[PDB]
């Protein structure tokens, strides 16, 4: 009797991946030990480690210009590694689209990077992606692809000669992406690619050249992890094992275009539920910028109905719906592992709740 | 058919913890979701998270002079965070006893810390703990409690007025410890405390004061984590729940004295097997400094017999015995989760192997 789980992160996992991990938790593939229980420096772990790097690259159709790194510390460590590694004497340009770019900006500033916020939707309470124009000569250009709290998402990434850096945590592996100008593309794994404690970084070879000329701690150095293929120290073996099952699961589904079609179907139906509610529900996001991953909305007339909505949802087996504190209201996260039928259950519940409380 | 697993890290886990985790992997406490699948800021994760902190403190009989922090990045990240937070304009004293101390030394130097190596075992290939004299006015004094590769272990920690930093990764929760002048006590958790991807830091309050005046990235700042109760970002929730099951397991055994006495029994039996072998097996470590955790030895009169030893041990159901490349030979890790019967099984193998090949 598993709950339908709309948590924004950590988030629900495909049941078949959970089932596989359960059935072999004490005895991986009959080898007589848990995947959790051996050295990373074994043929067996390597198979998983290097198979995951390759499948990630296949899903995104990445070429040999990129390395796939598996690091610890979630996306937040990246806010610091990114500037530490890829910064030079130049300007580092950032587009401010939510809580997570504010944080990233603060960390670079802490590191004493010359930071320029070239655009921002903060005034409007981050309810849209502003027009972003990067300069062509910056050290790098930084965006957050999908703003988890506000429920906004870039439709197209900005075009620039400047190396583009993308925090794709909450839309990771959700759709095909144009890497033409992308120098680094990364995500906390725990939204759309597994479990927490693992981050997956796609880094372009020219960026690694930048790490090489930097004198920073090994653990914080991209080049160090590259040369050691993300086994400089112990990686999160279990997490990588889960990522790898996730990769297979994404492959067995038809790849990122298939995943993206299912996601669009789910989002369309949920946003239609909002728009056809005769104004009883209202979304935070500008329609042009509506995220496919995180749907943030309010009960427009009566905020006091929101904690009631959440509790009745729970009583009806749907969890994780409370909006983030910074914003309030409701947030339905409908990541890859959530299916169209579960979103329909939420939609029927929303109609019923309105019929009851309008 | 579970193997007897002597891996040095990640290491074997108490089968009863694995069986619990397996059992409730899809449905934690019958609540309708996996422990891996919900938010860190629910009352359900918080109970596990904060319970683990308290019990860790209980096992070491620590008071409120210490905070327990749960961080990502293994011990290796600590090689950097330690001098980034705790270093001052003074000199930072290190005792060199193994590969992990050499690494820690290098990382502090990379950060331009004034490092003094006050003692070193390197000349004799780290086969003993040298005599360690720390000055009384340094910023901190750093030691590695148990040197995993060489099989040496401090019997008593150096006494000094300088704040003592201890890397206890490979003997964590193995024995009681005198914290009289310990300012920070830490470990990568996957030797005795669960799974990789989690580190447990015990940090004395006066140390956090030093962090308070540092201008460093939030993720790398001890005070940031203390202030946010190790929930500044998404902690590795699975790892932390595993740790908590470990903590309950240690408590159910009678605490650290009982654990240590079981470990002395096991190590005493292995070392006897080596010592009574009429020279056939020989240990790397000087006897006074023999580790209770990692027993590193060679086949004295025939190196070429070692890979045979490993393979035969394997077919006899025992894994993880290959020594580290740096030393070769054989290495039996006998962490808490290994029992004396398993150490008896290896001794009988050792006797049979000798009979065959001597």
Curated annotation (Swiss-Prot), chains A, B:
- Protein's cellular compartments: Cytoplasm
Q: Which CDD domains match?
A: PSAT_like
The residues listed in the UniProt record as binding L-glutamate, with positions renumbered to this chain, are 41
Recorded hits in HAMAP family, A to Z, give: SerC_aminotrans_5 (MF_00160)
What EC identifiers does the entry list?
A: 2.6.1.52
Sites where N6-(pyridoxal phosphate)lysine occurs are at 191
What is the protein's given name?
Answer: Phosphoserine aminotransferase
Q: Tell me which SUPFAM superfamilies the record gives.
A: PLP-dependent transferases
Q: Which GO terms describe its cellular component?
A: cytoplasm
């Amino acid at each position: 009797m598993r709950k339908i789980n709309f948590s924004a992160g950590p988030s629900t996992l495909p049941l078949e991946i959970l089932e596989q991990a359960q059935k072999e938790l004490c005895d991986y593939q009959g080898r007589g030990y848990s995947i959790m229980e051996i050295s990373h420096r074994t043929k067996v772990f390597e198979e998983v480690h290097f198979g995951a790097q390759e499948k990630a690259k296949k899903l995104y159709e990445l070429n040999d210009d990129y390395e796939v790194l598996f690091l610890q510390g979630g996306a937040s460590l990246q806010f610091a590694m990114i500037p530490m590694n890829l910064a030079l004497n130049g300007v580092c340009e950032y587009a401010n689209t939510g809580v997570w770019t504010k944080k990233a900006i603060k960390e670079a500033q802490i590191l004493g990077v010359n930071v320029k916020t070239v655009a921002s939707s903060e005034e409007s309470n981050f309810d849209h992606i502003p027009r972003v124009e990067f300069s062509d000569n910056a050290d790098y250009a930084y965006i957050c692809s999908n703003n988890t709290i506000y429920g906004t998402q870039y439709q197209n990434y900005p075009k620039t000669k400047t190396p583009l850096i993308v925090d794709a945590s909450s839309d990771f592996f959700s759709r095909k992406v144009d890497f033409s100008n992308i120098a680094l593309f990364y995500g906390g794994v725990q939204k759309n690619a597994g479990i927490s404690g693992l981050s997956c970084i796609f880094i372009r070879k020219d960026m690694l050249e930048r790490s090489k000329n930097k004198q920073i701690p090994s653990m914080l150095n991209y080049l160090t992890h590259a040369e050691n293929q993300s086994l400089f120290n112990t990686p999160p073996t279990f997490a990588i094992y889960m990522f790898n099952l996730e990769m297979d699961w994404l492959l067995n589904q038809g790849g990122l275009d298939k995943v993206h079609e299912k996601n669009s179907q789910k989002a369309t139906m949920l946003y239609e539920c909002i728009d056809l509610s005769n104004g009883f529900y209202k979304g935070h996001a500008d329609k042009k910028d509506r995220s496919l991953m995180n749907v943030s909305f309010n009960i427009a007339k009566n905020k006091d109905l929101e904690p009631l909505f959440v509790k009745e949802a729970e009583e009806a087996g749907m969890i994780g719906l409370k909006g983030h504190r910074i914003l309030g209201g409701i947030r339905a996260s409908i990541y890859n592992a959530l299916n169209l039928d579960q979103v329909k259950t939420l939609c029927e519940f929303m109609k019923e709740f309105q019929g009851k409380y309008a």
